[PDB]
């Protein structure tokens, strides 16, 4: 399938460490070059390091050198980033990408990205509180109800409405960081006034660091 699946990325206290891995599916890694690129939040793409699995020859961006180390286990068909002495600069999403076998030196395939958050502050799990679509929220008819992830750290939260059954007119708002330094967002979905008392409308918030999975339904009272 030519799939890259990242892992390792959580919260790290500054000076800390963190092992990132990239799973290889549907091709052998000895064949190509593997790369780690990070994208700081809001900022652009920055290359971090690469590796030829066959000989294990590796080059590294100077912004990390002597701190990060890139490695692979041809066995498992996997590549790793050991990141030591992290600074809040290093707070960023880390993608592994590949180089299209030989003489096609482009990044045809990339992982989903793993988020490293280089901060001392603790891992708060989220509150989930449903939304009331009263007589101040109907358009007469096609009306709106939702959820609200109230307090969490670090990013991110995977909200699923009716476990991905429900798609259309689902707006999940960027997280906004609170006076507290705790994240709050707001997940919403639009429905006709009559199907309030029809189907089960349940956003299933997941804060993955705090292994929390609260599945709160939205009632109209």
């Amino acid at each position: 399938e030519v799939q890259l699946v990242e892992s390792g990325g959580g919260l790290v206290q500054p000076g800390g460490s963190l092992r990132l891995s990239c799973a290889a599916s549907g091709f052998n890694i000895k064949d190509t070059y593997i790369h780690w690129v990070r994208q700081a939040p809001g900022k652009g793409l920055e290359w971090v390091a690469r590796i030829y699995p066959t000989n294990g020859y590796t080059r590294y961006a100077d912004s990390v050198k002597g701190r990060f180390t890139i490695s692979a286990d041809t066995s498992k068909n996997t590549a790793y980033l050991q990141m030591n002495s992290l600074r809040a600069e290093d707070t960023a999403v880390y993608y592994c990408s590949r180089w299209g076998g030989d003489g096609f030196y482009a990044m045809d395939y990339w992982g989903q990205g793993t988020l490293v958050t280089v901060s001392s502050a603790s891992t708060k799990g989220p509150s989930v509180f449903p939304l009331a679509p009263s007589s101040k929220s109907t358009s007469g008819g096609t009306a709106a109800l939702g959820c609200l992830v109230k307090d969490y750290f670090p990013e991110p939260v995977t909200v699923s409405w009716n476990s991905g059954a429900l798609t259309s007119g689902v707006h999940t708002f960027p997280a906004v960081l609170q006076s507290s330094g705790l994240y709050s967002l707001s997940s919403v979905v639009t429905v006709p006034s009559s199907s309030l008392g029809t189907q089960t409308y349940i956003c299933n918030v997941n804060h993955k660091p705090s292994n929390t999975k609260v599945d709160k339904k939205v009632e109209p009272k």
Binding site: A106, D108, P130, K136, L148, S186
Partner: protein
């Protein structure tokens, strides 16, 4: 090392409009440049390799040319699915170095919000706080203001404005304003209102509630 200077950093063109993004390499790179499209909080996607070549599966709208050290991604017909950030990358040396990225937004006919007002939950009142939501849905352009006038007061402490990214079919943004209130704050007041003046409206339209 070898730096790729990408302009412009920000853009706004309506559908089928012709779009040109330019990346200039501090040194000769030969044909060793590739162009990428990173959709909101997804990973980058290769459009163009070897400066001019079109990655299998990519639409033909997308094109790439070189002028020695000057490089151009063109989209003949800009489609709203095209809303992303677009990146150049050199790979002639190590490191590979990318452009500062071009963020493409889609001009669409003016579309006014769908203001909804929501209260703080009894399990939220139980937790011991009282946060209020004001959801402006699917509206263009971006710019607007959400004035909360609770019991007829204008409170600069609470206002928290999370906007969604341009929709990939309508190219309307959505916006959430949240009133940050410790339950103590909320216990007293009863009438609560959030007010909005937008480029889609000939009247600021308010959405308010009362506790029953």
């Amino acid at each position: 090392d070898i730096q790729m200077t990408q302009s412009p950093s920000s853009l706004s063109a309506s559908v089928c409009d012709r779009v040109t993004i330019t990346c200039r390499a501090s040194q000769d790179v030969n044909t060793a440049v590739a162009w990428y499209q990173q959709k909101p909080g997804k990973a980058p996607k290769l459009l163009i390799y070897s400066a001019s070549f079109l990655y299998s599966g990519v639409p033909s709208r997308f094109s790439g040319s070189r002028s020695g050290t000057d490089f151009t991604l063109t989209i003949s017909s800009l489609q709203p699915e095209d809303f992303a950030t677009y990146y150049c990358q050199q790979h002639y040396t190590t490191p590979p170095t990318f452009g500062q990225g071009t963020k493409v937004e889609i001009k669409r006919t003016v579309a006014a919000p769908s203001v909804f007002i929501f209260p703080p939950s009894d399990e939220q009142l139980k937790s011991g706080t009282a946060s209020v939501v004001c959801l402006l849905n699917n509206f263009y352009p971006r710019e607007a203001k959400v004035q909360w006038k609770v019991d007829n007061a204008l409170q600069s402490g609470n206002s928290q404005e999370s906007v969604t990214e341009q929709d990939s079919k309508c190219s309307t943004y959505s916006l959430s304003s949240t009133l940050t209130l410790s339950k103590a704050d909320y216990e007293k007041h009863k009438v609560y209102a959030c007010e909005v003046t937008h480029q889609g409206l000939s009247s600021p339209v308010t959405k308010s509630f009362n506790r029953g």
